[PDB]
Structure formats: C-alpha cells, structure tokens
Structure 1
Amino acid sequence: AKKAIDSRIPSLIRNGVQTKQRSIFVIVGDRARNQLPNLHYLMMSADLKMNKSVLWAYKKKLLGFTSHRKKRENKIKKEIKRGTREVNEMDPFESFISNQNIRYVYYKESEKILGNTYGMCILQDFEALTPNLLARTIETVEGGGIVVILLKSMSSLKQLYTMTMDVHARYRTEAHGDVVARFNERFILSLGSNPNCLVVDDELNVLPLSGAKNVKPLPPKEDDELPPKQLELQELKESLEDVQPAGSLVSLSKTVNQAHAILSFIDAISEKTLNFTVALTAGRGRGKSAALGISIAAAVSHGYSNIFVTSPSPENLKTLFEFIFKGFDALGYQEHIDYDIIQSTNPDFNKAIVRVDIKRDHRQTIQYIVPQDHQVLGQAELVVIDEAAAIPLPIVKNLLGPYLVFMASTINGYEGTGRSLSLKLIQQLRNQNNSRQLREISLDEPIRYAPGDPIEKWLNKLLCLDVTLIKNPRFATRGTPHPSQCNLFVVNRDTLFSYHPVSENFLEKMMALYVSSHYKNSPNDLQLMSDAPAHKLFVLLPPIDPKDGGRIPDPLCVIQIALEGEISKESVRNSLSRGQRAGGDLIPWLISQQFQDEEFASLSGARIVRIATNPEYASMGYGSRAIELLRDYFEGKFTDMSEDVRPKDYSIKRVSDKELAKTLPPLLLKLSEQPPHYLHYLGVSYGLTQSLHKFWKNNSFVPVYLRQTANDLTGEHTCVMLNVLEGRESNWLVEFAKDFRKRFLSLLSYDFHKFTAVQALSVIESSKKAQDLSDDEKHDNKELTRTHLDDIFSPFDLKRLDSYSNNLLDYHVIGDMIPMLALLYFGDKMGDSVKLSSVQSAILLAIGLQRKNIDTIAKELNLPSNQTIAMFAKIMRKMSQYF
C-alpha cells in the first residue's frame, strides 16, 4: 500500500532547494527508472520556480523504453486492441516521459549540451562514466537540482557490496589483463565522502553507506533573510541605479565578481587608452562571456566604431554573441532596426554570426577575425581575444599591439589544456606588463549554483581539477637535492586510486605537477592512467630524510609509460575477443606506415606519455636524471641479478564470485622490487619546440618522424624520437634516421619553411646522432663522381659558378644554382673536403632548402645583409674550389 519513505530524502532535496545547492542520488536496482518521477516531483513540490528540464545521458540504448512519441502511442494503441491495457491508464513513468521536457543525449555527444542548463540530470549507465562526461553534465545541472546515477548492473552492485563491507577488498572477477575500473571504484568510495549524496535502492530505502545519512531538515527560511553575496549584489545594484547608463548592465551581472570585472572593463573603455590591457581569467560557469558582452555593450555606448573579436572558432563565441545581444537590448538596440546580423558565408562555421553592424549614431562594426590574421588589426580600436590560452602562444605574441586588449582565459577549466595554457599565458602576461599596462581580474563565483557547492567540491576533488602546485618549505629549507641523490620509484596504481587520504594528497601533488608541466591536458587522462593495463607510473623522489619521520614526500618528476609492441599484442587479442580494441600502440603503427618494416612489429618498446618536472625548479637536471634512471631500470641495472627473490605481487586481494557466495599495498615501490619485461626501445611523441628538442637530444633520443602539418591547437609539429636500449641492434634505428634525414631535407621546402635554420640544423644533428652512435663504420656517404656532377650540373652552369666565385655575375643568376648545391652539402656526398661554419651552414640551408629571402635570413641572424652576402660568397667560393 503506502509506505512512508525515509525522512532523509525529502530533507535532502528541500535543503538543496533552500541553500541553492545540488544533490546527487544513486538508485540501485531495476526500478530506478520507476523511482525517477518521485524525485522529480519532490524537486518541483519543493520549488515552483525550479527549472523543469530533464537531461538523460545514456551510452547505447534507452533503459526499457523509447523516445519516439508516435512509436509509444502506436504500441499503446496496439495494446488497447489486444486488450491488455485499459483505455485510459498510464504508468507514472510513462506519464513522466510523455509530459516532461527531456533532452536525450549520448555519452559521446556531450559537447552539444554545454550551453544548456537543466533542472535534473540522469546518468543511465554507470560503467561507462568518463570524467569529461561527468563534468559536462554536472556543470549543466542548476542549483537545487538532482543528479541521479542508475546502478542496474549486477557486477557494479557486487563491487559496491564488497567494497562497503571491506574498503580494502575489491571485486575483480573473471578479469585477465584488461581494463580495471579503478576510477569507478574511487568514484564509489568518494560518494561516501560527499555530503549531498544518497544511495538508495529501487524501493527508496536509504543505504547507510552514503555521506548524507546524518542529514537533518533545515529550518524554514526567512523571506527577509538573503545570502550575503546577494546582499552585496543589492548594494552594487544600488550603486548601478545611481550610475547611468551602465547601471542596467551592472544589474544584469549576476555575481559581484562579474560586477567588479565589468567595472574594470568600463574603466578601461573610459580611459580609451591603447596601451591598456585587461586580462580576465575565469572558472567555467562564471560568466566571463557575460562580462565581455557587457564590455562590448559598454564600448558601443562609449561610441567605439571598431570592435575585433578573435577566437579559435566561433562556437566558442556564440555565447558571447547572445550576451552582447542582450547588452544591446538593455542599452536600447534592436534587431532589424538599429543593428543587423550578417552570418557566416563559410559553411564550416555553421552560419555563425561573423558581422554585427550598428546603424544608429556613427557606423559601428563588431567583427569576428581569424587569430593568425593580424595585418587587418592596424585599424583596431577594441579587440577581445577570447580563449587566448587556446590560441597558440606565438600567435598571441604577434597579436599584441597598440589597441585596447581584453583577454579571456579559462583558469581551472574542465579541459586541462585550458588551465595549463592559462598558467603559461599568465607568465606571458607578466612578460607583457613589463611597456603596456595590464590589469588582471579573476572570476570564481558560479551563477548557476551557490558558492561552496558540495557537488562541485566533490567533483573537483575527484577529478583533481583544482589541484594547484605549491612550493615545499621543507625542500626549500633543506635546499635543492642533488639529482644523483634523487631516486626513482614505481607507483602502485591500485593503492594510488584506493582513495586513502594519504594517497589522495600524493595524487594531488602528481596531478599538479602533470598539469603545471604540460600545456595539453584532458580529464580523460586520469581515467587513462588509472584503467589502462599497459600504463605504468614512475616518480622521482628526493633522498629520504629521517627528519621527515614518515611524512608525505613531494614528487620532483613524474613519468608515464605506455607499453607498445609485441607484449601488447596478447592484450589486443583479448580486447578483440571482448569487442573493441582501445588504441594499443601508436609508435609501432606510425613506424609501420612511414617505413615498411616487419621487424618493428616484432620489436617491443615503451613510449613516454608525459615527463613532468616542477616549473619552480629551473635547470635542476631532474628530468634528465629521471630519464637516465628509467633507461637503467629498463636495461636491468637496478634489477637484482638473483632470481631467488620472491616476486611479491602487491595486487589487492580480489574477491571472487565464489568468495561472495561463501593491509593495503605500498604506495611507492623500489625499482628492484619489480623486474621489467624485455623492452627494445624507448620512444617519445611530442610537439616540436626548441627546449624540448634540446632536452631529448641531451637524453640522446634520435628523431625518426616529424609530422607534416602542425596541430591546430598547439601550432607545433609532432615529432617522434626513439632510443635503443643496450644489447639491442641499432641498425634499424640508423636506417630510420638516415631516411628521416633525407625526408627532412626534402620537406624543408614546404611546411617546414617557417622553422628557423638553427632549429633545422638542430634536427639534422639529432638525426646524425644515430650515425655517430653507430658502431659500424662500413656505411658512409659515397663521394660525388665527376660523371654524376656533369649529370646534375651543366658545364656552363659550373662556368657561371666560377664566374660568381670571381664575383663577375650577380645573385639573381646564382639563385638557380643554390638549392641543388645545398642538398648536396647537407647530404654530405661531396665529402669532408669543405667544412662550413654553423652560421654559414644556416645561411645555406635557409636559402636553399627553406627557400627563404636573404633579407629575412639577415633579420633572423641579426646580421648585416652585406655581411651575409659576403659570407655566402665565401661559401660558394669554397664550393667552386671543391668543384
């Protein structure tokens, strides 16, 4: 009949409504979809102003129903014809689906829902939860909303049971070398830490494993009582009503951080100074686009004719566009009357608003521009550079100029490349302030939900997004430890993600190092390092001090290793047996495509996914020392020669199905504890920069591949470097390096034409490093024959070469003669007869292989043009002597 549900559930929902905080329910069982309408109606009975919209995120198929109205009513009518249903009867679940406004979304298509806000969210499938999807949905849930997770899987239920009976115990049944849901286990453990989480069954009985089990109903709120942030909003709105006409826009601002940023922007526009720069860094959901829309409206009110806005793509910018539109409406501008919208003629922009024209008063234009384009910026009054962190850094450096700059950056964004490139852009901002004046404003107050939201706090703790690097006072007092004193340790991933608080703090430090090190990140990287069998984690520690007394150590370097080769093939076969193969090897496939080589399929190697060193420590050599220790560990020097030592498998006790029918591992392990497999090589795949290339050159890696076209986000080409371990043949590496050298000499013509000659010679030297390290001296460049010379060069061309050697001719004749000669010199088939300087060889490569103009080469070298011409004349004089 009627069963009185537990008093914690309505208390939790009404507390969330009163405090504008979100809540999370985990419904376990088959009737979770039957219990959803009760939760939604409790939401709506608590709050009438609450948003009605429901979001349904599912992986593959809907849980027991369909979303098509005609299909549903046809099935109902056929059931009426059979007679199994009364003519007017509805399951409350069916009425819920029929009446309520539900947006159905796949897990893969979580990008579409980013702008929208939803009253309720329903994650149907737990086992496929990814951090990116989780963050994307929970950001859409408004304050007071409910995030429901449906647990309908028996395996997940048994994992939950075993885990709550024993936190130490884990349920991994019938699991070979494969994916292990360590992230899901950490999720389930963190649900007990969450204060606004209830775990209930299909009969709405509260399971006491939740964090909210000691919840109490709040006292009823007073209408006179208001939150202090809203009180400061009232004060700022009173000041706005005193002001005019920007006061309406300030009232339109939803947070005091928005109001302060808006007032700083308005002060900048009132100054109207070209040397002034305002840099706004915001969290996600903090209305940075709202602040910039008020900025554009305020500039229009001041009477700004030229508004240039740039972004990597206008799909980052439509939000700014409607925010600008409602700022225009608040000022008094109306569509088709005083402003007109010209959308994108380009189909790739999906009819995005590219041109905004304003007719009243003087002509005003708000136009979207390409970030790489900067020559049109000569007549720029105000420019908003949105997602300048996502914009590549040299593009930003070129983009800086004498015009009003409003920079937009996303600190602590869900995409970690946003916050890492935000840190690098903060460094570039500190460079920029050193000339043009700069003022920095930050936003951390959410508009959708209350500040200090428990769900947001739990999500940030779980995904390690808000991890920030902090200098170590103990390490500062003890001084920088010596790299030879430092040592390498393997991190056991199970106890790393066992959610013990010490391991949580350690993981926070490693994630802080990871993000602060590399400028490219994603939340799925955490699930990747947790749940991939091939991946291993290494940490470089300072030497252990007795004064620490068992305190948590602070990492110096972080190494991520992915095992790619023949050892991964047995796991790939298991993945093919169990459906999908989730991208095992990258370097073997790339080498197989670039080079037809059957032996590389047999060879097994390790790829360094990321090296991470602390930015505060500069030129410590910790990364190079870590690479040397890793190479020694894979060679076997740290490994004990005696095999009499026990393997000592520190895997956590895995509960079986028969065990259900019927002490933590060490966080850090010495290198001698585990013996690595027989690995043949090390590889790295990274965006080509001068510092990183120098670092890997000092680590003695040899390049075998450079990607033809650079990545759009980074702007740097992908380079692959290999290093053969000792005791393994390097003939294949030497052949690969030689063919890559020839390919690079050819490819300097097209898409490498923008490289500097110094970096080009650096690449050539790194390629020649393999030939230098090769023990066999049989292979050598063949000397250029006289018949070959007469074939590749005309005799009267040689006469012209001698004439310009005697300086009779000009440059414009010898320009034909240059490029083939440079190819000969950098192929070194001409021999060791003529040795050129480094600067002279840079000039020769720049003219010949890169097809660069001498004015540009002189500008790059910071040398006089006549001096460069004389140096080239000396080069070709040596050439003419050699011929």
Structure 2
Amino acid sequence: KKAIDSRIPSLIRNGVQTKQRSIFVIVGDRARNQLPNLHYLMMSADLKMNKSVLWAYKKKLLGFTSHRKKRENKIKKEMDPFESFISNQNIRYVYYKESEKILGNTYGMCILQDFEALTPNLLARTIETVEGGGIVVILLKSMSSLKQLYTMTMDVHARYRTEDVVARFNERFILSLGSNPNCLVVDDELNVLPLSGAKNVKPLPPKPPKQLELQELKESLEDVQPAGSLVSLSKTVNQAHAILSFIDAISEKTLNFTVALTAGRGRGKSAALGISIAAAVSHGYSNIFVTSPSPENLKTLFEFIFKGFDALGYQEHIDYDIIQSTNPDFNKAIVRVDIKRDHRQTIQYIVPQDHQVLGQAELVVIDEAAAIPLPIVKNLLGPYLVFMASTINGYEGTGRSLSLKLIQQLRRQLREISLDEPIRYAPGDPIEKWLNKLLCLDVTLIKNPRFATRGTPHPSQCNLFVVNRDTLFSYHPVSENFLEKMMALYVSSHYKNSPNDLQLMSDAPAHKLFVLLPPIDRIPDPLCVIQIALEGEISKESVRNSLSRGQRAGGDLIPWLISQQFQDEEFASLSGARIVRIATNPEYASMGYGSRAIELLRDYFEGKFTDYSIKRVTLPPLLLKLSEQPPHYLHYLGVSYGLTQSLHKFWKNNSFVPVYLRQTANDLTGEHTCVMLNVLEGRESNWLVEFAKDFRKRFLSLLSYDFHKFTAVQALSVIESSKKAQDLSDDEKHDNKELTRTHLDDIFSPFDLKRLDSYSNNLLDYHVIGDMIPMLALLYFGDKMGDSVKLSSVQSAILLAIGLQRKNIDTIAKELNLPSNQTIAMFAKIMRKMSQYFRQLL
C-alpha cells in the first residue's frame, strides 16, 4: 500500500470547494490505470458532481473497445479497476474531428487520449464543457512526448527536435501548463512531477458572493411582476442585469433604440433574450419579429421564451399557440407563436433577407448577429426597437473588432450590454484563464499614448523587419507580450478568425511573419503585421514528404485554382508567395501603413535589400531584419480576399491584377472570393496578361449570372484593374482587333442598324432596343470599338449595367443618384456616338 502525495487530494478538494477546474497530465504507459482512481477522489469529494465523462481520441482507444458485448466475449476467450470504470461510469467516446457534437453537453470530465494531435479548437471545445470542480486530464504516454518534457525541464532554451512540421504549439502548451496554478503533472505512480505550477498547493480550510448578490436581488423584485417572475429565472448577476436593461428598453418604448448584447458562449444570452421576449409579451408589445441565419438555432431561444411564459402564467393552447415549420430543411423548427391574452400578439421568425416585412415591426431580435452579412444587418436596422446578440469566440462567430466596427457604425441611440460571468461554473476558473493566455482569445488592442506624444510615424520612416518564429513562441515574457500585441492586431482587422490558425502560423514551415515596426529611437508595438506563405515549386518537396508519410499536408490553393481555370502547367512550376493576411490597426487606417509595408515586402523578395534555429538535441533575437536573411527566389505575389471596394481599392493601388472571381458567394460572409496577382520585376510577365484578358472576358459575361448584385461602379473598377494589366505589358504582341465590316454584318442585320439610327434621330422608342444593348456592351467593353468611341466613368457604368448586369434603366437612377430622365438623356448621347461610329466604317 502506497500513500498518495498530499498535493493531489488537496488540489482536487480545493477545486471542488471553490468549484474551480484543474488539470492533470499523466505520463506513463499504465496511465490509463490511474484514471479510475482519480475520478473516485471526486465522487468522494462531492457526490453532487456530474458523473458523465468525455473521452476524446483520434482513431483508436488505448487497449479496450467501447462495445460491452465484445468486452464480455473478449473476456470469455475478477477484474482490474480500469474495466470496472469503463463499465459503471457513463463515458462518451469522441473522435477529435467530431468536436462539434460536444459543444452543448456537460461532462464531469474530458480525457484527451493523444497529445500530439491536440489542436486549439479541439482543446478549447472540450474543456469549457467541464463543470466547476471538474478536472481535465491529458495523457502524455508517447515516448517522444516524454522526451520533449525532459529536455524542457533541464533547459528552457534548448528545444528537442526530431528529424517539416515544427509542432511549436505542443511545447508552448507544456510551458504554459507549468505556469498554471491548478495544473499538476504526474506519473503512473502518482508521483507529483515538479514541472507543474501547482507546487505549493495546500488544503484549503472547510467551507459564494455572487449568489448572495443574485439571491438578494430576487426577493427585492419578487413583488414587482412581471419582473419578479422573470428575474427569478436568471442564473447570474450579469444575466439579471441584462434582463433588467432589456426591460428598461421595453419600457422606454423608443423605436430608434438598439440594445447590443455581447458575451462568450455558454453565458446564457438566449435565456436573457428569451426572457426579455417574454417580458415584451407581458408588457403589451404586439408584433414580435425574430431573425437568425437559420430557425434551427433559435430552438433554445424559443424554449426559454416559453419558460418565461410559464413564469408569467401563460399556458399553452389557451393564451398562446405554437406554429412549427413545414419545410424539411428546418426540421419542424418553431416559426411563429400567436398569443391571445388581452390582444393579439405575435412572435414570428423571419429570414434576414426579408427586411421589407419589418416596416410594421415594433421589435426585432437579431440572434448571432456575427453570422449575418454586414449589408443585410444594416438593412435590418429600421425605425424600431432592436435587440442584437453577437457571440465572441463562440461557434465561428467573428473577429472582435468587427463587433467593434459595428459599434463605431452605431456611433440611432445604442445601448451596450456585456455578460462576462459564466453560468456553468465559478467565475475566474483558472483553466479558462489559462486557455485564454495560450490561445490569446481575449487579447485586446490598446491605444499607445507614446504614439500620440511623438505623433503618428510617417510611412517612409517605418522599416519592415522579419520575425523569428522560434523566438516568438519560446514563451519568454517579452516574447509573449509581443505575441498578444500582434495577435491583437490579427483578430481585429479581418472578418473571421478560427482558433486553429494559431497552430497554422506557428508549425507550418512555409508561413513567414513580417511586421511593419515603427522607426527605432520598451517592447516595440506593431503597426502592421504581414504573414506570407510560400506556394509554388518550393512547396513540392514538403508535399512529397507529406505523400511519403501518407498524410498530405495543407494545400496550394492557387497553383490549384489557377490550374483549374486556365490549366497552365507553368504556374504550378513558378515559385511564389501569397499574403494570407494584412493587418493594420483600424484606428490608424487610411494612413498608408499597409501600402508601405507591401512596398517594402515587394522590394525584399526582389533582392533590393541584399543560423537562427534554436538548438536541436541563448535564444536568437526576437526579430530579424530584411538584409540579415536572404529572400527566396520568387516569381509573383498573390492574395486572398472577398470582393470589397475598400480592399479592392487597396489592392489595385498596389499594382496587383485580378485573375479569378468566385461565382458562388461565400455563405458565411455572402461575399465572392478573389485572387489577385502581381509580377515581380525582372521576371516574365506575359502569362499574367493572358489570364487578365480572359478573366475580363469571363467577368463581363458573368456580371448578370451572379454578380448582378454588384454595383456598376464596383464592376467598372475591376475591369479597370484588369485593364491596368495590359498597361503593364509594353509589348505590342497581344492586342485587340478592330471589328471588320463582315463581323459587324453578322452580329447585326441591316434592319438592326436602321432602327439604331432612328434613336439617334429620336424617332423610335427605347424598349425596341432591348436586345442590342448587351452585344453593344460586349463589343465596347471588349474594346472592339477602338479609340474612336470613349465614355466617362458614369456612362461606362450605365452601359455596363444595362447591357451586362442587365438592370432596368430606373434601377440605375437610384444607384447613380441620377433622376431617370437624365439617365435616358446620357444613354441617348451614348447611343449617338456609336450610331456615328458605325457610319464612318460604312
């Protein structure tokens, strides 16, 4: 009989008493045999804890099958404790890929079988399901995984490295665990390994303020119906306050008022909204609208509305009636609730697109506003009471500063509400905080006063510097503070950001990090951060190595995409680089920092400026300068972005040329993806020109198919950007050909020409040139008309839109803010020029 180290029982008991979760890392082949004992220490600690256990594994379980019937048969062909546990307890087994299924359920435990396959999303997705007083176990059984730990302890600098993935995320995890006060690293013999941060854990004395502040609130409002019944349902002080604020908005009755509710996942927003919706019902609000990307997501909200209805004394089938959808796609989701108490009141679901119906709306509730395109939500912001809920780091969600970007747009009276306390466990649980440091999820951009005192640096003075990934991710205090700052700049600028990208920027070799630092004269504060990935022949060697492993790693989108559209073998060979992300601080937006950085970036790989690996079984400088490291030989620079006028304006000014536009708008943004290229000086450029003309011909025909939503001015821009590509080519080899008389004859009959002249003479009516406009737009924007015919931007937009995007003329009047009659007038002026042009040819 062996006595367990007093640290293990003390920490578990401390967590249960404080309702704080803890981490254990077990190293050893027999580690599984320790898992049974550890749980029993819980159930001894508290019997009220949830018994369900989450088991996550990659492909295989460790030496057992989860099929009972087999397990008896395997036994057939006395037990150890281990199988006793797998028998009696409720264990839910999970493939790492299918982490989405687990997002809702609660578990006393999560067991992470395979450390090497750990990912940020999977790690974030598992732990938050653990309840207060719960425990997280990570099983470090792999011999190599043991090797790294030993190297880490002997020295914090030298990194063990096996024979392309650097896997850097796995060790920063290790060092971060050592920082955690509630993490213990242990062997299969229950010996507390001193690498843990939980070294001086002492048993707390035997036995929360938030419940006191929540309890007291409930009695004080008990007499105040309908508030008392509704506030009773609240689980946290913030949740009650949010409900009270919603009631205040409901009482104010101001139809220019917007309420913004921001919280992390699991903080009970839908309960607050569902309760608030019930409050408006009892208050007397008649027409209720609710909108979400899909009605299926609103099931929780509708459920919590009915619980509020139960709290308010409303009864099903007498006071209110529930209507569910008949469409199989929404799976019988609730669409409408009709309420008959004291007058006809209606709660109905609407698709976000159908904003026209909201003219009669007295309130709309926008759930998960992060998931709806920005154009749609602004249309949804009508003259009525608005409740908006947006998730931060929940589901896909959106970047933090996008939530802010909505706020500065609101800067219509707006009310902001934030729910910080979780409803599942004690506030300030260490693991969530320890998560937060590692994944940098809650990093917040901070305005730097020093910039203001010395002023904003003029772009020329700013100098670009390369950043060493090894030294960044060494978990040094200085390095980390730089990580948060750059990550703060990361999450802000761009629309959407998943948690896995942190692993991507670190471990994948082709990814390189550039930052536009301010001129040197304290930890430097990034002004712009640039991350590049090398794609081309350079990546082929790594891909073949991935093929040898059997597990193809990543993808060359652009060698692939360009291959599919044009089937050019040369590009697959051509080495190049793609800017995954340009991050510039929104507050210093429009000062040209980004344009300066890409210019320096453009110069660096052109050679105008012409070992730091950590020891493999003192650290190199954090950042490296352009001269100090030789650039790779590159042929081109590429980019990914959804077509926005600001971005497309940003790119075109920086001499990139579009090559492809996706017909299918991305569902999550509603936006079409672009790939836009630029050829470096001294390297062959003709092939760019060949695609740009094709894409132009592609784009003009596809204007109406799916791009008809695009504005004509936006359309005119991208052709202009494509037209710049031929200007890059001084060569006279590839050229437009003017129309021959024979070709003109084929495209238009003589009767066609005669009627056109009538219009130039004003003798015939507009609609009778329905058909010829598109070809004419094809001919002119094909440049077939030649130097003879030219038009200004607005006229080109008008002709492009009618001919190719295919609107009626009146629609153009609104877009160009021109009254309809003049739009006809300019069009006729446009018509006369080519009616003239055809004549001289004749």
TM over 0.5, yes or no? yes
Query: Which deviates further from its counterpart, 234-243 or 588-597?
Result: 234-243
Q: Is the 8 A contact 2:402 2:492 kept in 1?
A: no
Q: 1:581 to 1:291 in 2, by over 3 A?
A: same
Counterpart residue number, 1:114: 103
Tell me the distance in 1 between the aligned counterparts of 2:243 and 2:778. Answer: 58
Report the CA distance between 1:91 and its aligned residue: 2.2
Tell me the distance in 2 between the aligned counterparts of 1:348 and 1:56. Answer: 32
Q: 1:823 to 1:459 in 2, by over 3 A?
A: same
Report the CA distance between 1:614 and its aligned residue: 1.0
Report the CA distance between 1:348 and its aligned residue: 3.0
Counterpart residue number, 1:868: 823
Tell me the distance in 2 between the aligned counterparts of 1:76 and 1:330. Answer: 54
Tell me the distance in 1 between the aligned counterparts of 2:34 and 2:519. Answer: 56
Tell me the distance in 2 between the aligned counterparts of 1:157 and 1:342. Answer: 58
Tell me the distance in 2 between the aligned counterparts of 1:508 and 1:171. Answer: 25
Q: Is the 8 A contact 1:538 1:560 kept in 2?
A: yes
Report the CA distance between 1:712 and its aligned residue: 1.1
Query: For structure 2, which runs of at least 5 residues remain unmatched after alignment?
Result: none
Tell me the distance in 1 between the aligned counterparts of 2:326 and 2:24. Answer: 46
Tell me the distance in 2 between the aligned counterparts of 1:12 and 1:526. Answer: 31
SS in 2 for 1:187: helix
Report the CA distance between 1:335 and its aligned residue: 5.0
Query: Which deviates further from its counterpart, 472-481 or 358-367?
Result: 358-367
Q: Is the 8 A contact 1:410 1:422 kept in 2?
A: no
Q: 1:154 to 1:475 in 2, by over 3 A?
A: same
Tell me the distance in 1 between the aligned counterparts of 2:662 and 2:331. Answer: 29
State TM-score, norm by structure 2.
0.97
User: In the TM superposition, what whole-angstrom CA distance separates every residue of 1:785-804 from its partner, at most 9, and x where no partner exists?
Assistant: 11110110010110000001
How do residues 34-53 of structure 1 correspond to structure 2 at under 5 angstroms? Answer: 34-53=33-52
Tell me the distance in 1 between the aligned counterparts of 2:45 and 2:391. Answer: 35
Q: 1:153 to 1:340 in 2, by over 3 A?
A: farther
Tell me the distance in 2 between the aligned counterparts of 1:380 and 1:396. Answer: 15
Report the CA distance between 1:361 and its aligned residue: 5.1
Q: 1:314 to 1:131 in 2, by over 3 A?
A: farther
Q: Is the 8 A contact 2:390 2:397 kept in 1?
A: no
Q: 1:416 to 1:321 in 2, by over 3 A?
A: closer
Q: 1:67 to 1:337 in 2, by over 3 A?
A: farther
Report the CA distance between 1:334 and its aligned residue: 4.7
Q: Is the 8 A contact 2:274 2:304 kept in 1?
A: yes
SS in 2 for 1:867: helix
User: In the TM superposition, what whole-angstrom CA distance separates every residue of 1:373-407 from its partner, at most 9, and x where no partner exists?
Assistant: 21222332321101112211110111111222111
Q: Is the 8 A contact 1:568 1:584 kept in 2?
A: no
Report the CA distance between 1:810 and its aligned residue: 0.8
State TM-score, norm by structure 1.
0.93
SS in 2 for 1:251: helix
Q: Is the 8 A contact 1:490 1:671 kept in 2?
A: yes
Tell me the distance in 2 between the aligned counterparts of 1:468 and 1:779. Answer: 52
Tell me the distance in 1 between the aligned counterparts of 2:836 and 2:638. Answer: 43
User: In the TM superposition, what whole-angstrom CA distance separates every residue of 1:180-223 from its partner, at most 9, and x where no partner exists?
Assistant: 110011000000011110011111110010011111110111xx
SS in 1 for 2:744: helix
SS in 2 for 1:561: strand
User: In the TM superposition, what whole-angstrom CA distance separates every residue of 1:422-445 from its partner, at most 9, and x where no partner exists?
Assistant: 122222222xxxxx3321111111
How do residues 188-203 of structure 1 correspond to structure 2 at under 5 angstroms? Answer: 188-203=174-189
Q: Is the 8 A contact 1:413 1:419 kept in 2?
A: no
Q: Is the 8 A contact 2:511 2:533 kept in 1?
A: yes
Report the CA distance between 1:228 and its aligned residue: 1.9
The equivalent position to 1:725 in structure 2, one of 680, 687, 692, is 680
Q: 1:114 to 1:356 in 2, by over 3 A?
A: farther
Q: Is the 8 A contact 2:399 2:494 kept in 1?
A: no
Report the CA distance between 1:768 and its aligned residue: 0.7
User: In the TM superposition, what whole-angstrom CA distance separates every residue of 1:466-517 from its partner, at most 9, and x where no partner exists?
Assistant: 1100111112111111211111111111111110010000010000001111
User: In the TM superposition, what whole-angstrom CA distance separates every residue of 1:538-563 from its partner, at most 9, and x where no partner exists?
Assistant: 0111111xxxxxx2100011111111
Tell me the distance in 2 between the aligned counterparts of 1:366 and 1:68. Answer: 46
Tell me the distance in 2 between the aligned counterparts of 1:7 and 1:417. Answer: 45
User: In the TM superposition, what whole-angstrom CA distance separates every residue of 1:802-822 from its partner, at most 9, and x where no partner exists?
Assistant: 001100001111222211111
Tell me the distance in 2 between the aligned counterparts of 1:357 and 1:58. Answer: 47
Report the CA distance between 1:315 and its aligned residue: 4.4
Q: Is the 8 A contact 1:416 1:465 kept in 2?
A: no
Report the CA distance between 1:12 and its aligned residue: 0.5
How do residues 198-209 of structure 1 correspond to structure 2 at under 5 angstroms? Answer: 198-209=184-195
Tell me the distance in 2 between the aligned counterparts of 1:139 and 1:628. Answer: 43
Q: Is the 8 A contact 1:179 1:532 kept in 2?
A: yes
Q: 1:127 to 1:356 in 2, by over 3 A?
A: farther
SS in 2 for 1:257: helix
- Residue identity over aligned pairs, in percent, reads 100
Q: 1:335 to 1:49 in 2, by over 3 A?
A: farther
Report the CA distance between 1:101 and its aligned residue: 1.5
Tell me the distance in 2 between the aligned counterparts of 1:20 and 1:741. Answer: 62
Query: Which deviates further from its counterpart, 340-349 or 796-805?
Result: 340-349
Report the CA distance between 1:415 and its aligned residue: 4.2
Counterpart residue number, 2:483: 507
Tell me the distance in 1 between the aligned counterparts of 2:332 and 2:148. Answer: 48
Report the CA distance between 1:166 and its aligned residue: 0.9
The equivalent position to 1:448 in structure 2, one of 411, 421, 424, is 424
Tell me the distance in 1 between the aligned counterparts of 2:755 and 2:234. Answer: 74
Tell me the distance in 1 between the aligned counterparts of 2:607 and 2:698. Answer: 35
Report the CA distance between 1:336 and its aligned residue: 5.9
Tell me the distance in 1 between the aligned counterparts of 2:311 and 2:340. Answer: 17
- State the superposition RMSD in angstroms: 1.5
Q: Is the 8 A contact 1:487 1:541 kept in 2?
A: yes
Report the CA distance between 1:360 and its aligned residue: 5.2
Query: Which deviates further from its counterpart, 664-673 or 772-781?
Result: 772-781
Tell me the distance in 2 between the aligned counterparts of 1:584 and 1:814. Answer: 49
Query: For structure 1, which runs of at least 5 residues remain unmatched after alignment?
Result: 79-88, 222-226, 431-435, 545-550, 640-648, 656-662
Query: Which deviates further from its counterpart, 264-273 or 815-824?
Result: 264-273
Tell me the distance in 2 between the aligned counterparts of 1:859 and 1:247. Answer: 51
Q: Is the 8 A contact 1:24 1:197 kept in 2?
A: yes
Q: 1:351 to 1:495 in 2, by over 3 A?
A: farther
How do residues 558-707 of structure 1 correspond to structure 2 at under 5 angstroms? Answer: 558-639=529-610, 649-655=611-617, 663-707=618-662
Query: Which deviates further from its counterpart, 473-482 or 565-574?
Result: 473-482
Q: Is the 8 A contact 2:391 2:397 kept in 1?
A: no
How do residues 141-160 of structure 1 correspond to structure 2 at under 5 angstroms? Answer: 141-160=130-149
User: In the TM superposition, what whole-angstrom CA distance separates every residue of 1:255-285 from its partner, at most 9, and x where no partner exists?
Assistant: 1111111011112223333222211111222
Tell me the distance in 2 between the aligned counterparts of 1:773 and 1:68. Answer: 67
Q: Is the 8 A contact 1:195 1:211 kept in 2?
A: yes
Tell me the distance in 1 between the aligned counterparts of 2:122 and 2:316. Answer: 36
Query: Which deviates further from its counterpart, 322-331 or 616-625?
Result: 322-331
Counterpart residue number, 1:416: 397
Report the CA distance between 1:75 and its aligned residue: 2.3
Tell me the distance in 2 between the aligned counterparts of 1:290 and 1:416. Answer: 19
Q: Is the 8 A contact 1:186 1:499 kept in 2?
A: yes
Q: 1:736 to 1:868 in 2, by over 3 A?
A: same
SS in 2 for 1:562: strand
Q: Is the 8 A contact 1:416 1:515 kept in 2?
A: no
Tell me the distance in 2 between the aligned counterparts of 1:12 and 1:394. Answer: 51
Report the CA distance between 1:332 and its aligned residue: 3.0
SS in 2 for 1:52: coil
Report the CA distance between 1:3 and its aligned residue: 0.7
